[PDB]
Design a binder for this molecule. Sequence first.
Ligand SMILES: Nc1ncnc2c1ncn2[C@@H]1O[C@H](COP(=O)(O)OP(=O)(O)O)[C@@H](O)[C@H]1O
Ligand SMILES: [Mg+2]
Ligand SMILES: [Mg+2]
Lengths: 263, 29
Amino acid sequence: QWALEDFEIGRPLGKGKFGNVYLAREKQSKFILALKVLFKAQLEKAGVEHQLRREVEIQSHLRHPNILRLYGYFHDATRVYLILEYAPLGTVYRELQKLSKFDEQRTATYITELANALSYCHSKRVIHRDIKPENLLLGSAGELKIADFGWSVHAPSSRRTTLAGTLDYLPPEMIEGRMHDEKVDLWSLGVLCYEFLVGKPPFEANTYQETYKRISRVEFTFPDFVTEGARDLISRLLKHNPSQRPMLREVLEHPWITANSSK
Amino acid sequence: LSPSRGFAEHSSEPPSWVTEMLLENELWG
Ligand SMILES: Nc1ncnc2c1ncn2[C@@H]1O[C@H](COP(=O)(O)OP(=O)(O)O)[C@@H](O)[C@H]1O
Ligand SMILES: [Mg+2]
Ligand SMILES: [Mg+2]
């Protein structure tokens, strides 16, 4: 069993809902890692222990270059610790903050890496349901890695009804609390592709009520600089009917993607 | 991996967007 004494601790890397994520190093191997801390009292008050249970059992199962590794876990009197792969280049969120918008090459490359990661997830009947920029991390070579599986589920036989995720990235069936499946991640992929190119997600409004309505009615428009190929991909992903959204194979082979991705 | 058991949705904290929508509803309709 791991314990805190197995690790050297460094600076906070980021801030989570239930605690910070810290730079860490395994003492024997000097291997650099991240330690995600969750305070037990806060978890218990919020009553979301099942999210942590799902996060651990699902993410420790996954082995893919574009999915953040979870190596192990432990706890003490007051805290739960998740031992994670360290992502040195930070979040896609921060990168978008600094660049305002991504060019088509960078965007298509990220979408390729996301589609590969999601293809692997969906083959194991895992749905992520929260793939927003602050949960997309960057490896040492700037490769995208999906992280934060606290909203994920293993759904091999039945559809889900949980109210989950983050409004701006959610499809109509999820915000309306209807039955949903792996196609929710395809909708979020469309939101991301738009946000990467434009700098803001497509259904952004000043009020949550208005954003909710815009999502439900698929109300968004394209700025003039978004190209024909990008419009085609995004419009196909942001379909109200989940079954009309493309397979991930279709995303990976889309002409705008293959023309622009460096991967 | 086992199929993910559901939970008691109203026994715990909802996503923050739900809480914000409820506030908007209570604050100005
Ligand atoms: N393995 C990691 N390497 C580097 N930074 C990380 C890592 N994990 C998390 N972070 C940073 O910590 C933040 C919160 O982590 P996350 O796992 O998403 O927590 P929460 O479940 O509370 O959202 C991330 O948005 C990111 O800024
Ligand atoms: Mg997160
Ligand atoms: Mg989380």
